[PDB]
Design a binder for this molecule. Structure first.
Ligand SMILES: CCCCCCCCCCCCCCCCCC(=O)OC[C@H](COP(=O)([O-])OCC(O)COP(=O)([O-])OC[C@@H](COC(=O)CCCCCCCCCCCCCCCCC)OC(=O)CCCCCCCCCCCCCCCCC)OC(=O)CCCCCCCCCCCCCCCCC
Ligand code: BCL
Ligand code: BCL
Ligand code: BCL
Ligand SMILES: CC[C@H]1c2cc3[nH]c4c(c3C)C(=O)[C@H](C(=O)OC)c4c3nc(cc4[nH]c(cc(n2)[C@@H]1C)c(C(C)=O)c4C)[C@@H](C)[C@@H]3CCC(=O)OC/C=C(\C)CCC[C@H](C)CCC[C@H](C)CCCC(C)C
Ligand SMILES: CC[C@H]1c2cc3[nH]c4c(c3C)C(=O)[C@H](C(=O)OC)c4c3nc(cc4[nH]c(cc(n2)[C@@H]1C)c(C(C)=O)c4C)[C@@H](C)[C@@H]3CCC(=O)OC/C=C(\C)CCC[C@H](C)CCC[C@H](C)CCCC(C)C
Ligand SMILES: COC1=C(OC)C(=O)C(C/C=C(\C)CC/C=C(\C)CC/C=C(\C)CC/C=C(\C)CC/C=C(\C)CC/C=C(\C)CC/C=C(\C)CC/C=C(\C)CC/C=C(\C)CCC=C(C)C)=C(C)C1=O
Ligand SMILES: COC(C)(C)C/C=C/C(C)=C/C=C/C(C)=C/C=C/C(C)=C/C=C\C=C(C)\C=C\C=C(/C)CC/C=C(\C)CCC=C(C)C
Ligand SMILES: COC1=C(OC)C(=O)C(C/C=C(/C)CCC=C(C)C)=C(C)C1=O
Ligand SMILES: CCCCCCCCCCCC[N+](C)(C)[O-]
Ligand SMILES: CCCCCCCCCCCC[N+](C)(C)[O-]
Ligand SMILES: CCCCCCCCCCCC[N+](C)(C)[O-]
Ligand SMILES: CCCCCCCCCCCC[N+](C)(C)[O-]
Ligand SMILES: CCCCCCCCCCCC[N+](C)(C)[O-]
Ligand SMILES: [Fe+3]
Lengths: 302, 281, 240
């Protein structure tokens, strides 16, 4: 049988690649991590370097704090018993204040205040991480598409934990930190708003989620199929169209009657993906604030 | 009718059936034997849906719905107006999809490219077939399949899910979801990264793939590379669907109770089942 | 009703997004042509976008698209029918002429360059200190084509420096010259490298490179197009 380019046949390695300098503060870059032959069957063998820096440290410390706040609470629920900890790991849950506290920071530690502390650390972890995606692109002179994309994920996140609770007038509306409990919250959210299948924004979010898998399956398969002409060297095919980019366009023109370009497929990609959490965040944000019951709304469109 | 670069590729050859008989295009579209098969299957299927619509007495696209046989018919035939149309339309659908994939193969062969695309598509077909064919058969009735209608297929998802409690607890479903979310994540990042290189800050030169690796190493300490990301997007999205099909083919067959109870196997493990405290003691 | 407004607005936004995306995707290959190369009458409902310019690194210039399109090479094909929509038969040897699945594009006759302005792809021997790190080392193996005859032997691997990956095998023929074979078109086995795309008599015809330690974008296109073309055009001498 023909080779399929799913896994490499032969790996090669040379000096650790320390990357491009441009305007990056090099004092803030680590050295190179190890080389993973395992990884290199599929992708790159090299680990690191990574860029540290002040924002980086803040974000990581903050993220750990969020993680350790939830896990401390979990140990407490476990009665400090390691065997109960593991047994009940997916059952534990750090839950937001009760409705009676509204938006106040007045809830007791054990009954909501700790949820707020974990949430506070999460907020600075994510935003400073967002700042990192902007700044690393800037230092390299690149466009800001990453940070613009990330912002669409942030939007659903912010709607769920922050903006929708504030508009609803209480932290009790927010999502609990737990494996099983976040899932129960999701089922409940839908039940209580008359079935999210009737929310047109949920249905769009689905079209886009499924569309992402359709599209990445299409694009990933297309590139692999023309990798025998260097198709995956996409930036150079943008600059100087090759037979890869042409055979790829024509596969699709002949199949379904239209096609993209090397650059433009990446625009279909970025939008198909960001539109998941946008549409999504809109549909959630409208739930309970403007529309109490999607089935009901859907009976009127109004 | 042709892209500026297109004529050199429009040579004869690559067909699987019929030699030169259907080796031609209509505008942009390649035909082939499977182009003809697709048209026949799709057309018959679409006609039968319009007939189903007449017998239902509606033309509204939001109301038209073609239902499989009621559970009492088991795995046998049903009068047209009562499940038979569904059954024929399903055969047409299947014919159309498999024909589409095989036309894609004819196209690959003419273009001298790999078969990755029709291979990927065959995952989607397999998933559709899981729901309309493999699962209904294993469960003993067509009536377990979803109906063809815009809102009624959603009623089916909701009803089917809530048959087993909160369907979130299906562990294969959890994996499938994880692949879907991760796929959208990787898609956003891939799109964004290429574009950020190709479209750099105002007045600067196009960044290189070395800048692409750099940005990702700077960000998270790793970069899968340009081959790797396309391998990845494919793996993630096919995995998502493999697990979707899995999660449903096991549901109503090997597992048919409330999915949340499946998780008890872990809590009830002898060495900790009876230690008090926590949530489950 | 605010949610009604939002949804109606969203669909207007999406119509505009799709128009934007489709027109972005027309920066290459348009305007559409008839089979004879002249502009087709029906260009469809989407108009070409305003051009944009990419600044290429390393003094290589710019690229503005959409721009005037032309093949910049002869296409040895002829019509097989008196009306539109049929295939075009090769007028000579389609492998030699570079049409059909053997097609190449007239890309720049310079090497792709890395972010430092060095040649992106080099023979491993000239790449300090790149080496095989996992898998069967193909260097030294006999190379077999789809006729099950030996065509030559692997004398090096050409690697992508910045991405640390194997791109071509360099294969020495009976006459002592070499050819590049794309990594994606070979099966490395324990005792041989196997090439399904070419019979052994087609190796000599693989397009040669002009300088023995670099390869240009144009040369990559010819080599790859030619090897892939063998799937269709070598099929008489295969045989598995
Ligand atoms: C409530 C919702 C909450 C929203 C939350 C979050 C939203 C996050 C959005 C995510 C953006 C990702 C898209 C990436 C992108 O292409 O933009 C790059 C681009 C940045 O480029 P770069 O990476 O820095 O540099 C590279 C190049 O220089 C330049 O880079 P480039 O050339 O690659 O990118 C250029 C890009 C830049 O475009 C943009 O700025 C983004 C734009 C869009 C706009 C409208 C958004 C609507 C959201 C949905 C509304 C739903 C209703 C409810 O141009 C477009 O893609 C164009 C627009 C297409 C939309 C057209 C639409 C519809 C209108 C229709 C009517 C028509 C017909 C009716 C029938 O984005 C921006 O300029 C945004 C600046 C924002 C400044 C903030 C200050 C605001 C005060
Ligand atoms: C996949 C698991 C479940 C499922 C659960 C859901 C849920 C949940 C939702 C949908 C939604 C959709 N589903 Mg469904 N649905 C399934 C089976 C399918 C099948 C099939 C197997 O043949 C089809 C054609 C559809 C099609 C549809 C679309 C009407 C709608 C948007 C999908 C989308 O953008 O996808 C992504 C792919 C693209 C972006 C490509 C575009 C192709 C689409 C637009 C094709 C539509 C065809 C449709 C009108 C059929 C007409 C047939 C004609 C006779 C030819 N579903 C099974 C049973 N589906 C959403 C909706 O809003 O429904 C009202 C939604 O919330
Ligand atoms: C019983 C369940 C209800 C329902 C209730 C809900 C609810 C509630 C919601 C969804 C939402 C969604 N649903 Mg629904 N869902 C229903 C049934 C379906 C079905 C189906 C039946 O087949 C499908 C396919 C979907 C599909 C989807 C998605 C389209 C959408 C979420 C997209 C997303 O990427 O979010 C995942 C992405 C994020 C959550 C963003 C992540 C943000 C960033 C900032 C993450 C930071 C994390 C970091 C700190 C963690 C650190 C770890 C690191 C490794 C270090 N639903 C039924 C009817 N659905 C969401 C939505 O938008 O709805 C409109 C949502 O809120
Ligand atoms: C109340 C409802 C239940 C629920 C009940 C179920 C049920 C029931 C099912 C799922 C399934 C899915 N659910 Mg669930 N699930 C819920 C909550 C969610 C949530 C969430 C965030 O809460 C999410 C993300 C999901 C996500 C998942 C996915 C893993 C999976 C659907 C994708 C898929 O099967 O693709 C597979 C893709 C296809 C089947 C499409 C194939 C179509 C191809 C071959 C061709 C179509 C072509 C043609 C007609 C197009 C027209 C041509 C035009 C020219 C365009 N569910 C809640 C708890 N879920 C489904 C699943 O796994 O199915 C296998 C499923 O059956
Ligand atoms: C547009 C929609 C899709 C999307 C987009 C998206 N997500 C993204 C990006 C974008 C483009 C960003 O660029 C950003 C990113 O950097 O990706 C690499 C991100 C991101 N999305 C992430 C996850 C994520 N995204 C979500 C999904 C989605 N993201 C959507 C499907 C989800 C889901 C589906 O629930 C998850 C969970 C992260 C990988 C990253 C944001 C990272 C972040 O905000 O960090 C904050 C917190 C920390 C930095 C540390 C947290 C603590 C950890 C639990 C500790 C364990 C590891 C630790 C790093 C070890 C270090 C120890 C040292 C002391 C040695
Ligand atoms: C496997 C990963 C993902 C994936 C990949 C994938 N899909 C594929 C392919 C690939 C690689 C393409 O090659 C192929 C394509 O050409 O894309 C542009 C395709 C394709 N995926 C498509 C749709 C699609 N894919 C979906 C999902 C997925 N596809 C997965 C998530 C979905 C979802 C998520 O619901 C849909 C709706 C088409 C755009 C296309 C295949 C088009 C095709 O087969 O055309 C031939 C048949 C017709 C022209 C119509 C036939 C009409 C029927 C006979 C009657 C209708 C019956 C139907 C069952 C009724 C449904 C009613 C609904 C309301 C439920
Ligand atoms: C790098 O490379 C890449 C390209 O190129 C450079 C590309 O183009 C693409 C392709 C991707 C795009 C163009 C992006 C946008 C695509 C999507 C979002 C995918 C979803 C597609 C649709 C919504 C439309 C699908 C429409 C179809 C399937 C057309 C229906 C055709 C018919 C009329 C069916 C009837 C039968 C036919 C045509 C057979 C012929 C028979 C006769 C007429 C007789 C990818 C992935 C890529 O990676
Ligand atoms: C073994 O023991 C160790 C030490 C290792 C500890 C182990 C750790 C463990 C087991 C912890 C596991 C953590 C888990 C299970 C986390 C799961 C969280 C989930 C599933 C999150 C899901 C949704 C989260 C959302 C939507 C959160 C949204 C948050 C915001 C938008 C932030 C809002 C901020 C608020 C409310 C504060 C506002 C304050 C100001 C500044 C006004
Ligand atoms: C923009 O494209 C992307 C890459 O950037 C070049 C990546 O590298 C990755 C990261 C993928 C993996 C496998 C991380 C896990 C591997 C390790 C380090 C154990 C993703 C998702 C991606 O989208
Ligand atoms: C989401 C991907 C996560 C990647 C994990 C991070 C690996 C980079 C570690 C580099 C550390 C280098 N070191 C150990 C020599 O200092
Ligand atoms: C995220 C990627 C993880 C990659 C792990 C996959 C390893 C599979 C290696 C298979 C290689 C087979 N072989 C020996 C022919 O090379
Ligand atoms: C990148 C653009 C691709 C656009 C895909 C659009 C899919 C349309 C699906 C209709 C959703 C139906 N509804 C009622 C939930 O809005
Ligand atoms: C959602 C279904 C829409 C399918 C989009 C594909 C349209 C391609 C039509 C090709 C016709 C080209 N033209 C006008 C030059 O003949
Ligand atoms: C969200 C999917 C929408 C895809 C359909 C829109 C494009 C239709 C076909 C574009 C026309 C091709 N043409 C005539 C310019 O060659
Ligand atoms: Fe790509």
């Amino acid at each position: 049988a023909e080779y399929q380019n799913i896994f490499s046949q032969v790996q090669v390695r040379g000096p650790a690649d320390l990357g491009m300098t441009e305007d990056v503060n090099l004092a803030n870059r680590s050295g190179v991590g190890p080389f993973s032959t395992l990884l290199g069957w599929f992708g790159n063998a090299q680990l690191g370097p990574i860029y540290l820096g002040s924002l980086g440290v803040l974000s990581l410390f903050s993220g750990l704090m969020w993680f350790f706040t939830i896990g401390i609470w979990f140990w407490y629920q476990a009665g400090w018993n390691p065997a109960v900890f593991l047994r009940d790991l997916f059952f534990f849950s750090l839950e937001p204040p009760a409705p009676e506290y509204g938006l106040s920071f007045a809830a007791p530690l054990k009954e909501g205040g700790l949820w707020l502390i974990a949430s506070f650390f999460m907020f600075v972890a994510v935003w400073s991480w967002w700042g990192r995606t902007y700044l690393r692109a800037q230092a390299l002179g690149m466009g800001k598409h990453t940070a613009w994309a990330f912002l669409s994920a942030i939007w659903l996140w912010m709607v769920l934990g922050f903006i929708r609770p504030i508009l609803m007038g209480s932290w009790s509306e927010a999502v609990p930190y737990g494996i099983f409990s976040h899932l129960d919250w999701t089922n409940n959210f839908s039940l209580v708003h008359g079935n999210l299948f009737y929310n047109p924004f949920h249905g769009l979010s689905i079209a886009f989620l499924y569309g992402s898998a359709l599209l990445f399956a299409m694009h990933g398969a297309t590139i692999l199929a023309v990798s025998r002409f260097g198709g995956e060297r996409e930036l150079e095919q943008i600059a100087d169209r090759g037979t890869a980019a042409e055979r790829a366009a024509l596969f699709w023109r002949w199949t379904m009657g239209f096609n993209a370009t090397m650059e433009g497929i990446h625009r279909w990609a970025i939008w198909m993906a960001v539109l998941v959490t946008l549409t999504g965040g809109i549909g959630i944000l409208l739930s309970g604030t403007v529309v109490d019951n999607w089935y009901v709304w859907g009976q009127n469109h109004g | 009718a042709l892209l500026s670069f297109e004529r050199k590729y429009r040579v004869p050859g690559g067909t699987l059936v019929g030699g030169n008989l259907f080796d031609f295009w209509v505008g942009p579209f390649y035909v082939g034997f499977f182009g003809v098969a697709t048209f026949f299957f799709a057309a018959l299927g679409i006609i039968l849906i319009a007939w189903s619509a007449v017998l239902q007495g509606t033309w509204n696209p939001q109301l038209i719905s073609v239902y499989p046989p009621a559970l009492e018919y088991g795995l046998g035939g049903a009068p047209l107006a009562k499940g038979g149309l569904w059954q024929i339309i399903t055969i047409c659908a299947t014919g159309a999809f498999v024909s589409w994939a095989l036309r894609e193969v004819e196209i690959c062969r003419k273009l001298g490219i790999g078969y990755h695309i029709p291979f990927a598509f065959a995952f989607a077909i397999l998933a559709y077939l899981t729901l309309v064919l493999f699962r209904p058969v294993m469960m003993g009735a067509w009536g377990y399949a979803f109906p063809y209608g815009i809102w009624t297929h959603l009623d089916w998802v909701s009803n089917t899910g809530y048959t087993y409690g909160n369907f979130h607890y299906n562990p294969a479903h959890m994996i499938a979801i994880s692949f879907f979310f991760t796929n959208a994540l990787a898609l956003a990042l891939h799109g964004a990264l290429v574009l950020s290189a190709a479209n750099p800050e105002k007045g600067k030169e196009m960044r290189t793939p070395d800048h692409e690796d750099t940005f990702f190493r700077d960000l998270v300490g790793y970069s899968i590379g340009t081959l790797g990301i396309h391998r990845l997007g494919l793996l993630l999205s096919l995995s998502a669907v493999f697990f979707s099909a899995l999660c449903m083919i096991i549901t109503g067959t090997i597992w048919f109770d409330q999915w949340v109870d499946w998780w008890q196997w872990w809590v009830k493990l002898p060495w900790w089942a009876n230690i008090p405290g926590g949530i489950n003691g | 009703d605010l949610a009604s407004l939002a949804i109606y607005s969203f669909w207007i936004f999406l119509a505009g997004l799709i128009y934007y995306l489709q027109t972005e995707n027309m920066r290459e290959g348009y305007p559409l042509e008839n089979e004879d190369g002249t502009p087709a009458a029906n260009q469809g409902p989407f108009p070409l976008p305003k051009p944009k310019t990419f600044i290429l690194p390393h003094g290589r210039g710019t690229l503005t698209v959409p721009g005037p399109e032309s093949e910049d090479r002869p296409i040895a094909l002829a019509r097989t029918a008196v009306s539109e929509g049929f295939p075009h038969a090769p007028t000579g040897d389609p492998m030699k002429d570079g049409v059909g699945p053997a097609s190449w594009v007239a890309r720049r006759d310079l090497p792709e360059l890395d972010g430092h302005g060095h040649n992106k792809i080099k023979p491993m021997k000239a790449a300090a200190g790149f080496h095989v790190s996992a898998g069967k080392n193909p260097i030294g193996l006999p190379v077999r084509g789809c006729d099950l005859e030996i065509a030559g032997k692997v004398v090096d691997i050409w690697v992508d420096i910045p991405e640390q990956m194997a791109r071509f095998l360099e294969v020495e023929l009976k006459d002592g010259s070499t050819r590049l074979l794309p990594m994606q078109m070979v099966k490395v086995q324990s005792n041989r490298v196997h090439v399904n795309a070419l019979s052994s008599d087609l190796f000599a015809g693989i397009p040669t490179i002009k300088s023995p330690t670099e390869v240009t974008l144009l040369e990559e296109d010819k080599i790859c197009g030619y090897v892939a073309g063998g799937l269709m055009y070598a099929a008489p001498k295969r045989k598995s």
